[PDB]
Design a protein around this motif. Structure first.
Motif, PDB file in Angstrom:
ATOM      1  N   UNK A  20       0.832  -1.183   0.000  1.00 46.23           N
ATOM      2  CA  UNK A  20       0.000   0.000   0.000  1.00 46.23           C
ATOM      3  C   UNK A  20       0.872   1.240   0.000  1.00 46.23           C
TER       4      UNK A  20
ATOM      5  N   UNK B  94      -0.323   4.340  -0.337  1.00 46.09           N
ATOM      6  CA  UNK B  94      -1.090   5.490   0.115  1.00 46.09           C
ATOM      7  C   UNK B  94      -1.046   5.562   1.630  1.00 46.09           C
ATOM      8  N   UNK B  95       0.144   5.865   2.140  1.00 44.27           N
ATOM      9  CA  UNK B  95       0.401   5.883   3.562  1.00 44.27           C
ATOM     10  C   UNK B  95       1.277   7.080   3.865  1.00 44.27           C
ATOM     11  N   UNK B  96       0.855   7.909   4.807  1.00 43.85           N
ATOM     12  CA  UNK B  96       1.513   9.192   4.987  1.00 43.85           C
ATOM     13  C   UNK B  96       2.928   9.020   5.458  1.00 43.85           C
ATOM     14  N   UNK B  97       3.131   7.956   6.222  1.00 42.46           N
ATOM     15  CA  UNK B  97       4.440   7.658   6.779  1.00 42.46           C
ATOM     16  C   UNK B  97       5.281   6.663   5.975  1.00 42.46           C
TER      17      UNK B  97
ATOM     18  N   UNK C 205       6.917   3.466   7.460  1.00 39.32           N
ATOM     19  CA  UNK C 205       5.590   2.967   7.781  1.00 39.32           C
ATOM     20  C   UNK C 205       5.025   2.165   6.634  1.00 39.32           C
ATOM     21  N   UNK C 206       4.463   0.998   6.928  1.00 42.36           N
ATOM     22  CA  UNK C 206       3.802   0.187   5.923  1.00 42.36           C
ATOM     23  C   UNK C 206       4.804  -0.586   5.073  1.00 42.36           C
TER      24      UNK C 206
END
Ligand SMILES: *[B-](O)(O)CNC(=O)c1ccccc1F
Ligand SMILES: *[B-](O)(O)CNC(=O)c1ccccc1F
Ligand SMILES: [Cl-]
Ligand SMILES: [Cl-]
Ligand SMILES: [Cl-]
Ligand SMILES: [Cl-]
Ligand SMILES: [Cl-]
Ligand SMILES: [Cl-]
Ligand SMILES: [Cl-]
Ligand SMILES: [Cl-]
Ligand SMILES: [Cl-]
Ligand SMILES: [Cl-]
Ligand SMILES: [Cl-]
Ligand SMILES: [Cl-]
Ligand SMILES: [Cl-]
Ligand SMILES: [Cl-]
Ligand SMILES: [Cl-]
Ligand SMILES: [Cl-]
Ligand SMILES: [Cl-]
Ligand SMILES: [Cl-]
Ligand SMILES: [Cl-]
Ligand SMILES: [Cl-]
Ligand SMILES: [Cl-]
Ligand SMILES: [Cl-]
Ligand SMILES: [Cl-]
Ligand SMILES: [Cl-]
Ligand SMILES: [Cl-]
Ligand SMILES: [Cl-]
Ligand SMILES: [Cl-]
Ligand SMILES: [Cl-]
Ligand SMILES: [Cl-]
Ligand code: NA
Ligand code: NA
Lengths: 470, 470
Positions: B229, B231-234, B239-240
């Protein structure tokens, strides 16, 4: 002399110091701007020129001041005056010991998008900011029925009794997803998720949308929402979204209107003195959710208010006007992370009433500002509207569309009974059942191990252990 | 009897109780699996059958045990043995009063992707988990040079002296973006952002990528990263994302190799006893970043280590082996949010050495585990490798590619001097300057109000006020 009129032709003013005046004048000037640019044969390219724009905006304004235009609004005089008297008399009920509490409301006709009346703030003379039309705030958990659950249902990824994970989980950055002050609980139905407004089920729902490649943006943009970035883990809870009350009422109008969007408006027509039509609203209805989806969501949102878990509204209204409380109310609350913004969205089949409260500088409200204060205030507001126009809310019931599919499912899995695998042992999955509503062709699937929306392996081992327990 | 050999043909074992054995055996069995399925004319569809798979995996294993296969690995005997002796002798230096500290390392040849040696953990006999090849953890801030800054540079959205916002800002959910324990500071150059590893500049960089529609996934998947994914701000902070040490070394190999990816591998060839080739590594080089981008990043990552802000490594190494510390080291650290995982990635032009430490159950390390402990440990590890094979790290310098564009820019704006607008006053933008390196055709743009990567209106009013100040 130009005038602005109510929907029935009664003059509001000629071209006077309240929200109604400046809101309807501003919209009229925008419509006059587009009209005059076109009349003068100014292209899109020439319109991009900032100096040209400023000239045409000033032109549109003077054109109104000195012309004989008749500006027909959607505003209902009795209803709008009643809404002003309600906020004047009862607005103080918003004040929660976090300073003065501001407010916006918009009342909308579900079958047309017409705005019948609104509340711009506590008192124009003291603070002019327009909280119904101009200010934009996160819509918080009222995002969930539109962007998460409603789209999942419409896509046939979820039914009315589907089960979701509310077990602890982290954002991608490692922070626990919090709701109020709980790191989470266990599995739960969609109805419990909605009534309580838990966060984790909505997160997983939106992840499921992403994984299936769903065009969520197409849904939202059909309702006129502008969201810059869809790749946000907290989108479905209100993160990365900012809306006016007028725009957000229009999303709830879409659900209330059995899935059919009509574009919000406050000006219905502008004519020159000689009757030339300079502007006229053109209805463009769009089926945004299937009739099945919208009517299933109505059923769920009825119980959000009836359960009274995140809003006292139905109790408040029952006492003020018990016959109006027996109308078919549905709705959803929202609360931002530090209690900075509270929402309540309310619909009957006929009208939708949107409500926000918060502070102009974005400081926190009290823990209960939305549960109790805004609920009691909006109850007075709805009563005031009804007293001013007794039939306007209507006595129609929301009802499941004939196209809804009904499946018998396990209460525990939200899916049809059948064999499942639980390491080794293949098991007959028995126990008490319930009717679930779907918006696809075939309804609910056969039970399957990963039965819920979301969940970690730990989560499912626990869940299935508890389940097997009976 | 089948055997596994070092790169020069010396036998490791016949088909013995350490990481080397089980890692190289496992990879060999996978290559034998694909070979045997094809030999037997088993299709992709038949291969999907789980029973068929289990049979062929068992077949591949027995085939090795009873055959006469010669499995050629990439492993260098002297180097790998030295790395085992280093972790045996110095691994205790990892223990930081948060319990036993686990570790993984992978040493990779930048021009081939060959894995020369590795560290699977503190002691196979006590804990078998393979931390070099099998365990996956967030790579934390070592994500930033690859996914944020490097792609921005490659796209010509950023140069070596570009300015970024580190002013306070929130995630979409309303939580402050934190770094260590600061809500942020002010504007800063890319070099200061990297040296310090601040979070906010990376967030804004990735947002700028999203806004420009950049195919960030194409970059990452060319390096073999799997991220579910985007579409993750971090994302850009780790993150992710979850990676093995072997895979993550390969991203740093790509930067070190002037932008050209070679796929990591530990098996180079498998032959039957009669010389039939059952498997052979096929090089597939890919230019992932332009030579300009990669060589600009090398320059920045040199100063991440030289500055000593987030790692003591260069001091540690200078003392152990000052002539090896004068080789052209570049690198980046990473630390996850609760100090659960620490990384250090190191390269010379010839080799890349990846390093992770953390706990098997994901509990926190001490505040300094990565800054000091892992830095000192990896210094011993690099010294041990050098002593075992004196030329392996090499004495070559990283160098700007001739295709790099150099612009004279304002130190304060990271952009070329010129007139700018600061409400009303159009201003001559003067003051001390610096050479910035770009990977586009035209280099740096003319100064413009929104000069930085990110920033709120408040941020820019403040910044420009300070600037105007001189
Ligand atoms: B809902 O009951 O308002 C709960 N929603 C939130 O926690 C939430 C999360 C992120 C952003 C906005 C927001 F309202
Ligand atoms: B870096 O110095 O490791 C800082 N990175 C983080 O704060 C970060 C944020 C989100 C997820 C992982 C992570 F390492
Ligand atoms: Cl008004
Ligand atoms: Cl107004
Ligand atoms: Cl004119
Ligand atoms: Cl009227
Ligand atoms: Cl989308
Ligand atoms: Cl919007
Ligand atoms: Cl997206
Ligand atoms: Cl309008
Ligand atoms: Cl006229
Ligand atoms: Cl339909
Ligand atoms: Cl009720
Ligand atoms: Cl109540
Ligand atoms: Cl059924
Ligand atoms: Cl059940
Ligand atoms: Cl080993
Ligand atoms: Cl192993
Ligand atoms: Cl065989
Ligand atoms: Cl060797
Ligand atoms: Cl957070
Ligand atoms: Cl992408
Ligand atoms: Cl990966
Ligand atoms: Cl994406
Ligand atoms: Cl391999
Ligand atoms: Cl043979
Ligand atoms: Cl190139
Ligand atoms: Cl140095
Ligand atoms: Cl130091
Ligand atoms: Cl220049
Ligand atoms: Cl300067
Ligand atoms: Na709520
Ligand atoms: Na770091």
């Amino acid at each position: 002399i130009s005038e602005i009129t109510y929907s029935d032709g009664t003059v509001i003013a000629s071209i006077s110091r309240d929200y109604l005046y400046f809101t309807t004048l501003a919209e009229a000037q925008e419509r006059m701007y587009d009209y005059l640019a076109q009349r003068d044969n100014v292209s899109a390219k020439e319109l991009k020129n900032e100096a040209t724009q400023k000239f045409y905006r000033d032109l549109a304004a003077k054109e109104i001041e000195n012309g004989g235009y008749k500006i027909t609004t959607t505003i209902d005089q009795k209803i709008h005056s009643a809404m002003q008297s309600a906020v004047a008399d009862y607005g103080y009920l918003l004040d929660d010991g976090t300073g003065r509490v501001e407010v916006g409301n918009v009342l909308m006709d579900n079958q047309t998008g017409a705005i019948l009346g609104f509340v711009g703030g506590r008192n124009y003379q003291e603070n002019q900011n327009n909280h119904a039309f101009d200010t934009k705030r996160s819509p918080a958990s009222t995002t969930k029925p539109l962007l998460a659950y409603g789209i999942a249902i419409d896509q046939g990824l979820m039914g009315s009794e589907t089960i979701l994970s509310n077990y602890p989980t982290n954002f991608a950055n490692g922070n626990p997803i919090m709701y109020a002050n709980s790191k989470g609980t266990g599995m739960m139905t969609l109805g419990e998720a909605l009534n309580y407004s838990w966060n984790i089920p909505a997160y997983w729902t939106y992840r499921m949308l992403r994984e299936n490649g769903v065009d969520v943006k197409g849904y939202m943009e059909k309702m006129g929402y502008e969201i810059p970035e869809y790749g946000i883990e907290s989108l479905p809870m209100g993160g990365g979204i900012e809306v006016t009350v007028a725009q957000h009422t229009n999303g709830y109008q879409t659900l209330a209107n059995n899935g059919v969007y009509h574009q919000k408006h406050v000006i219905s027509k502008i004519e020159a003195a000689d009757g030339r039509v300079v502007y006229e609203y053109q209805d463009k209805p769009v089926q945004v959710y299937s009739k099945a989806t919208a009517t299933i969501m109505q059923g769920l949102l009825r119980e959000v208010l009836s359960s009274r878990v995140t809003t006292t509204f139905k109790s408040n209204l029952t006492s003020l006007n018990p016959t109006l409380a027996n109308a078919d109310w549905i709705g959803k609350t929202g609360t931002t992370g530090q209690d900075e913004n509270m929402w309540l969205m309310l619909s009957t089949p006929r009208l939708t009433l949107g409500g926000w409260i918060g502070h102009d500088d974005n400081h926190s409200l009290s823990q209960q500002a939305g549960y109790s204060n805004n609920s009691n205030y909006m109850a007075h507001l709805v009563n005031a509207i009804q007293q001013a126009s007794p039939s306007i809310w209507g006595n129609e019931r929301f009802a499941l569309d004939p196209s809804v599919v009904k499946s018998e499912v396990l209460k525990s899995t939200g899916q049809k009974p059948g064999k499942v695998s639980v390491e080794g042992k293949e098991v007959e999955v028995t126990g008490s059942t319930v009717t679930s509503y779907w918006a696809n062709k075939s309804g609910a699937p056969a039970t399957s191990y990963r039965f819920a929306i979301g969940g970690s392996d730990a989560d499912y081992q626990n869940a299935w252990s508890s389940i097997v327990g009976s």
